[PDB]
Structures are given as structure tokens and as C-alpha cells.
């Protein structure tokens, strides 16, 4: 995985690649690593895939109940606090490495959380196996007072660095833009720079190629 | 980490580098290791980032609840709450914490809490991996009842050397000044402190 988060003028943007691996093999060439905790709080997850999804959903569920209970829009620091205390309790055994970002009545926020439960604050962050490739780009091109379109460009460039240079990362770039006063816009497959070329041959078999021993109609009705 | 806290005439100053480490990779070069557990009781964190954050959060909660019932807690009391957590959970924690606060009766006070969870009240304290390299320097240069400017220079020069020799320390030098006047945050960048 390569994931990044970048703050700008009036909000925050996060991005991620779309490769999931099992050892050296690519299982999904287009998985979604960008998760919705609340409408305007999103999170990018690296590490153990089931852990990032499950921890994201649990805190997202509790955040919704909390929002309904308090009659208030949820805050990023609440998601941050709930995630870190959950992860700390499990002493790193829940392998979720997250970049949490969003907007709320307090403003725009960008955090990262490690599996053992430590949190960081920053204007630009990167996690995952391609974080070094991404951080190299972020450290080279980041500046104070970025515009929306500049931050998206920087974020996706940082993800591309991971896609091309990290074997753990690949395929596409997903983006989510969270701007203050506006709806969060999730940009699924914002870039698709790894389209499979036309195959040289069709491997459609002549009908009857496969030897068959038995046929039978399966009853799915009651 | 390289951290320290130093008492002086008007109160106490806390100091720290800004490096977080994940092997030889710098996971965060602008970390804030100086942390508020009460208005004028702060702590320097060293060891595990997760452990020290979890401890500091629990202490802040305890002192907030203390304040609601009994008013402002003493610096000694804050150190006792840190100790209780560090001592009783010594098997599962990697946390070297320096507690520093300002009373009006007691003025500036510094308590250091090493790995085992023992408490040691001192005029000044140094801790973290980078502290090893400045024991000689700090012992030779520390004086009691220094001024604010002298104490800032003492911490700046000390952490500068700790940062210079310790690979696990670096970035900016953060400082927090605790006096009757209030709470002041100071920052010092590489271009200044490296050429000291």
C-alpha cells in the first residue's frame, strides 16, 4: 500500500493506490482503501486489510450513534481518540495503520494512527510500504498555502511514486477531497495509468472442448 | 529522543527534540513531545510513542477530575499519578517521563520517572537516548536560580549536542516556559542550533 494525506487552503485531501497483495501475488487490482467514517470524515488504511476495514466500520458505527446522541456533526478528533484507544488496547495485534482526515465545525484536520495506538499531526503524511517513495515526493514539492487543485496534484503524484517504485503498490489512484463548507467528493479511480494492453489472442474455446461426465439441473426454488 | 526540564528563578522550562523513529526511518520530523496534563503542569515524553500518549491522556483525565473536585493539583500530585501508572504497569510499558510544573507556593519543580516507575525530584532532569551524551556537559554547566535567558541557552546548547551525537534525535528544538506570567512556547530551527 501507498496512502497519503495533504492539507490545503480550505480543507484536506487524502489519496491511495488500489493494489492488495498476498505475498508476491496481486489479488485485487482495484480495491478501495479510502473508507468513510462519517460523511465528511474519511480514512485511508494500510496494513492488515481486514483490520483496517473492521476498525474503520466499528468506529464509524459508534461515531454515527454519537452524532445522533449529541445532535452534532462528528469531529475528527473523536474518531482519532476512539481509534487510538481501541488499537492501544490490542497492543498492535490489530494491524491497522490509518491516515484520518476530514472537516467538522472545529475546522479541517489531518492525522495518522499506527497499530500500537500512537497518533501524529501534520500538513502532509504518508503510510504503507510505499510511504518512503511518497514522502520523498511530498518533502520535495510540498509548500505552505496550497490550493485545492495543487493539493490534489501533489497527493496523486505522491501515490504515483508508490505505484511505480514500490512493488507493494500499483494500479490506480483514488482520491477524496474534504473542503470546508462543501460536501466531501470521493473520486474513485481518479487516475487509471495502468490499463491492460490488448491481448494478442482470444482464448475462447470451441464448444465441447471440455470432457463432461454428468449433467443435472439444480433446484434453487422452494 | 532527547528531553529535559530545568528549574530556574522564575519557574521551570521543558525542552525536547522533534524526532519520531521507526527503525532508522524518521516517521515524524516535527513531533511535539512536550505535552499538557494541566494548565501549568506539563511533561516530556520519551520511549514508546503509543505508551507515553496513552499515559499522558489518562493523567490529563485524572487531573481534570481532580480539579473539578479539589481545585488545582500540585506538581507532586501529577508526578504521583504518572508514577502509579508507570510502576503498576512496568511489565507492559516503555515510558521515560519527566514531569514539570509551576506552583506559586512551590515555584518550579521537576520530577523524573524512569522505566521502573520510581520517582526522583531534581533541580533539573535529562532523559531519552540522547541524554547519555550530555551528562558531562549538563552537570558542568547547570547552576541553580538561573534567569530565563540563561536557562533557554542551557537547554538549547544541551539539546544541540544531544541531537548532534544521537541519531535517534533531531529536527527542531521545542521548549515550553512555565512561570507566573503564563505559558510560552518556543521553537528553534536547525540553522540556528547546529552552528552553536
Amino acid at each position: 500500500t501507498t496512502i497519503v494525506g495533504v492539507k490545503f487552503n480550505n480543507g484536506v485531501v487524502i489519496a491511495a493506490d488500489t493494489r492488495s497483495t498476498q505475498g508476491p501475488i496481486v489479488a485485487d487490482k482495484n480495491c478501495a482503501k479510502l473508507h468513510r467514517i462519517s460523511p465528511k470524515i474519511w480514512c485511508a488504511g494500510a496494513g492488515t486489510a481486514a483490520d483496517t476495514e473492521a476498525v474503520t466500520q466499528l468506529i464509524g458505527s459508534n461515531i454515527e450513534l454519537h452524532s445522533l446522541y449529541t445532535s452534532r456533526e462528528p469531529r475528527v478528533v473523536s474518531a482519532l481518540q476512539m481509534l487510538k484507544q481501541h488499537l492501544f488496547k490490542y497492543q498492535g495485534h490489530i494491524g491497522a495503520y490509518l491516515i484520518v482526515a476530514g472537516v467538522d465545525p472545529t475546522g479541517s484536520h489531518l492525522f495518522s494512527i499506527h497499530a500500537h495506538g500512537s497518533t501524529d499531526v501534520g500538513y502532509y503524511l504518508s503510510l504503507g510500504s510505499g510511504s518512503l517513495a511518497a514522502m520523498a515526493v511530498l518533502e520535495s514539492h510540498w509548500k505552505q498555502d496550497l490550493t485545492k487543485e495543487e493539493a490534489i496534484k501533489l497527493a496523486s503524484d505522491a501515490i504515483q511514486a508508490g505505484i511505480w517504485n514500490d512493488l507493494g503498490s500499483g494500479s490506480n489512484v483514488d482520491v477524496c477531497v474534504m473542503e470546508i463548507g462543501k460536501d466531501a467528493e470521493y473520486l474513485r479511480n481518479y487516475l487509471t495509468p495502468n490499463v491492460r494492453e490488448e491481448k494478442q489472442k482470444s482464448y475462447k474455446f470451441p464448444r465441447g472442448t471440455t470432457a463432461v461426465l454428468k449433467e443435472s439441473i439444480v433446484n434453487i426454488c422452494d | 529522543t532527547s528531553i529535559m526540564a530545568v528549574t530556574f528563578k522564575d519557574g521551570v522550562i521543558l525542552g525536547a527534540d522533534s524526532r519520531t523513529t521507526t527503525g532508522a526511518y524518521i516517521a515524524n520530523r516535527v513531533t511535539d513531545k512536550l505535552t499538557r496534563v494541566h494548565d501549568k503542569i506539563w511533561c516530556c515524553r520519551s520511549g514508546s510513542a503509543a505508551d507515553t500518549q496513552a499515559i499522558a491522556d489518562i493523567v490529563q483525565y485524572h487531573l481534570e477530575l481532580y480539579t473539578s473536585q479539589y481545585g488545582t493539583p500540585s506538581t507532586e500530585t501529577a508526578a504521583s499519578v504518572f508514577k502509579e501508572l508507570c510502576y503498576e504497569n512496568k511489565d507492559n510499558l516503555t515510558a521515560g517521563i519527566i514531569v514539570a510544573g509551576y506552583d506559586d507556593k512551590n515555584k518550579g519543580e521537576v520530577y523524573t520517572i524512569p522505566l521502573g516507575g520510581s520517582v526522583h525530584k531534581l533541580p533539573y532532569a535529562i532523559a531519552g537516548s540522547g541524554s547519555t551524551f550530555i551528562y558531562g556537559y549538563c552537570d558542568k554547566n547547570f547552576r541553580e536560580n538561573m534567569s530565563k535567558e540563561e536557562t533557554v541557552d542551557f537547554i538549547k546548547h544541551s539539546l544541540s549536542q544531544a541531537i548532534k551525537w544521537d541519531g535517534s534525535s533531531g529536527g527542531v528544538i521545542r521548549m515550553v516556559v512555565l512561570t507566573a506570567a503564563g505559558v510560552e512556547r518556543l521553537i528553534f530551527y536547525p540553522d540556528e542550533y547546529e552552528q552553536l
Binding site: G92, H114, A115, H116, S118 | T1, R19, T20, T21, T22, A27, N28, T31, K33, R45, S46, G47, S48, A49, A50, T52, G128, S168
Partner: peptide, 4 residues
């Protein structure tokens, strides 16, 4: 894990 992150250390200080």
C-alpha cells in the same frame, strides 16, 4: 513501532 514509533519511538521517541
Amino acid at each position: 513501532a514509533p519511538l521517541x
